[PDB]
């Protein structure tokens, strides 16, 4: 089906305390495969999935070299942005970049992205046509000019439509067993009363991959999501994910309160009634 | 873009020399290459930003620094004959902006010799069109012979009536060894200038072949009883024959 | 060999296609360049390619195939001023060495319509100690050969483009110091056409 590769980079300044912390992470769908952390032992790009370990030493040197180039740009960016916004040297600030590409079921290019943030809000972004930029404010307008004269969108479009998809396809065949598996959720339903006036009903989806899932509650046909407590999908730690949905329910209608589960590892979607 | 200095150099074994390289474009990444006939471009030293340098594949005998982003000098402390090459400075943005391309400097031909009494200026002669060529082709080829020079550091030009010409001239791409067996062999170069016969037969026009030599400087010392083979211009001429 | 190029030299006549090929070893290469270097000067950048497929600009078309690791340069409708050596350049990143091939030299032959090959004797203007034989107007298939011993200095064939009556001509010069040497005895060991004019 549809597949994606993203890289995520975070760089945080440490005023009075030397170089910024730099963390880069690579994913294919919801599966991590590479990391770099500037506080770690190796000082290299490191594998995080078994199917990427089979790359030879030139991959490992190149990626290490390039992630070092990235740390540097972000290092200088923290200094540059602090200048653009006239902030003091006393505070810590955060730079974030995310880039990558989506492919469809036939594995051809669908979409490419390259987003940049300062202090947790949008700074500059590559538009969907991979030709043009959205700048968040007047300070980011300076970067936009700088990158138009550096032909950055042209350089990124070449990567996002070529290299990025070429390399994702390589990862998806190398990682076939892992990356093209689909884990259906092991489902499960629990009752917890409070004081014999109400009852919480909790629907569970455990052990699923990929992370995308929909849980909806429903009072016999019409959906009851004006009561539902829905936690964030959380990692189990073994490559799979967990999520739960709950309604506070009067003592009698638990028969006619149904829980609806949607995940792509299921052929037909699941219905859960309390029994 | 990239400028480098000087264009030509003679040194003896042991002398020191610096090659300048300057760059206009806020490029972080500058590099030094040597080019040789047997083995293309070879990277000597490089630098991915101010303050910061590291070695290429042939760093030996070469010494480099980078206090400013604009400049990247390459120093030889003690010259050896194997450092006889064409050297190219190059620069490239790195992490900086502008066009994502590497550009080259125009080059420095350097020759290193054991004895600098090997340095000789060229002898220059203009030969005159065959009357058999004039009668058969209606065209008149003048050839110029620059002979006897070391090192091969010349620029040849033709100057009819006082202004330099381009349209008739075929110059040789590279000079030729007169004794192609010795390390310090002297060189020769030939050029052609073809005008029509009804322009050579005009007695008013003066044809001049001009060879620029790059040799020793003012501050080099000369003990031989020859004439000191400095940088100079050597010319030969012919007038249009009234026939 | 990190970057491998096409052998060389390449003779093509004016008007024809010069096709250049290049191979690299690093899978993760992301940037591809063609440089042009005329003899005695510096490499000049002429094409950049970044994506698979063709990139046309003027008379140059580049082609890149990253699966077979192949970079290509076509020169449509060649001219004598395309005569140069052409360098292929490949890199992976911001900080990676730009890897140069050894270059392929392209020689663009002038069309001469109807050649009359001829060896002419030249005497000097002032007071030189030799003479010269000029082999001129000859065929583009005609190769001149090497020096005889350490006496007979023979130059390579070169092209002049008289911007006059649109005349192009190949020429080469041989000379020797001592005169046990005529114009007949200058190109004895050279593949010279049998209808070559020998006047004196």
């Amino acid at each position: 089906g549809s597949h994606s590769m993203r890289y995520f980079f975070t760089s945080v300044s440490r005023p009075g305390r030397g170089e910024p912390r730099f963390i880069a992470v690579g994913y294919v769908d919801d599966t991590q495969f590479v990391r770099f952390d500037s506080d770690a032992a190796s000082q290299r790009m490191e594998p995080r999935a078994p199917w990427i370990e089979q790359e030879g030493p030139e991959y490992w040197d190149g990626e290490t070299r390039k992630v070092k180039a990235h740390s540097q740009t972000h290092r200088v960016d923290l200094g540059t942005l602090r200048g653009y916004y006239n902030q003091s040297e006393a505070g810590s600030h955060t730079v974030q970049r995310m880039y990558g590409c989506d492919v469809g079921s036939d594995w051809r290019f669908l979409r490419g992205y390259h987003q940049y943030a300062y202090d947790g809000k949008d700074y500059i972004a590559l538009k969907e046509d991979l030709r043009s930029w959205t700048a968040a404010d007047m300070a980011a307008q300076t970067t936009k000019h700088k990158w138009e004269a550096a032909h950055v969108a042209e350089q990124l479009r070449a990567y996002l439509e070529g290299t990025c998809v070429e390399w994702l396809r390589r990862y998806l065949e190398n990682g076939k067993e892992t990356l093209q598996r689909t884990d259906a959720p092991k489902t499960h339903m629990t009752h917890h009363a409070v004081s014999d006036h109400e009852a919480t009903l909790r629907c569970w989806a455990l052990s699923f991959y990929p992370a995308e899932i929909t849980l909806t509650w429903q009072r016999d046909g019409e959906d009851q999501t004006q009561d539902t407590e829905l936690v964030e999908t959380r990692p189990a730690g073994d490559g799979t994910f967990q999520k739960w949905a709950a309604v506070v329910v009067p003592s009698g209608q638990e028969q006619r309160y149904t829980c609806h589960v949607q995940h792509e590892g299921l052929p037909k979607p699941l219905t859960l009634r309390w029994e | 873009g990239v400028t480098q200095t000087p264009k030509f150099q003679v040194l003896k074994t042991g002398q020191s020399m610096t090659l300048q390289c300057a760059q206009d474009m806020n490029h972080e990444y500058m590099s030094w290459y040597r080019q040789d006939p047997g083995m293309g471009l070879r990277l000597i030293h490089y630098s991915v930003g101010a303050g910061i340098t590291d070695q290429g594949e042939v760093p030996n005998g070469y010494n480099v620094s980078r206090s400013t982003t604009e400049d990247f000098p390459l120093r030889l402390l003690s010259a050896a004959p194997s450092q006889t090459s064409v050297y190219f400075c190059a620069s490239r943005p790195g992490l900086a902006g502008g066009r994502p391309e590497q550009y080259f400097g125009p080059g420095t031909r350097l020759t290193v010799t054991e004895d600098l009494k090997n340095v000789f200026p060229p002898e220059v002669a203009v030969f005159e069109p065959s009357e058999a060529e004039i009668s058969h082709t209606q065209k008149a080829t003048l050839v110029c012979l620059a002979t006897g020079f070391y090192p091969d550091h010349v620029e040849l030009s033709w100057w009819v009536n006082g202004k330099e010409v381009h349209s008739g001239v075929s110059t040789d791409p590279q000079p030729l060894k007169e004794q192609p067996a010795l390390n310090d062999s002297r060189y020769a170069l030939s050029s052609r200038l073809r005008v029509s016969a009804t322009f050579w037969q005009n007695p008013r026009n003066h044809f001049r072949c001009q060879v620029q030599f790059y040799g020793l400087s003012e501050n080099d010392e000369w003990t031989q009883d020859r004439a000191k083979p400095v940088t100079q211009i050597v010319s030969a001429e012919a007038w249009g024959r009234a026939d | 060999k990190e970057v491998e190029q096409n052998s060389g030299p390449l003779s093509v006549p004016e008007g024809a296609i010069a096709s250049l090929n290049c191979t690299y070893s690093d899978r993760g290469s992301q940037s591809f360049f063609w440089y042009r270097q005329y003899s005695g000067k510096s490499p000049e950048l002429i094409m950049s390619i970044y994506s698979n497929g063709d990139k046309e600009d003027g008379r140059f078309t580049a082609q890149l195939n990253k699966a077979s690791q192949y970079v290509s340069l076509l020169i449509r409708d060649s001219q004598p001023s395309d005569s140069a050596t052409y360098l292929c350049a490949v890199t992976t990143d911001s900080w990676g060495k730009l890897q140069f091939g050894a270059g392929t030299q392209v020689v663009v032959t002038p069309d001469i319509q109807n050649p009359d090959p001829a060896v002419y004797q030249l005497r000097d203007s002032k007071s030189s100690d030799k003479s010269v034989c000029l082999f001129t107007d000859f065929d583009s298939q005609t190769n001149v050969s090497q020096s005889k011993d350490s006496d007979v200095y023979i130059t390579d064939k070169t092209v002049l483009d008289m911007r006059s009556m649109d005349f192009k001509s190949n020429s080469a010069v041989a000379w020797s110091n001592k005169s046990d040497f005529a114009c007949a005895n200058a190109f004895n060991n050279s593949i010279i056409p049998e209808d070559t004019f020998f006047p004196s």
Binding site: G26, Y59, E63, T73 | - | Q30, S31
Partner: peptide, 9 residues
């Protein structure tokens, strides 16, 4: 495989 030309803001 990472992008090869990151450029300063």
């Amino acid at each position: 495989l990472l992008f090869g030309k990151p450029v300063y803001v």
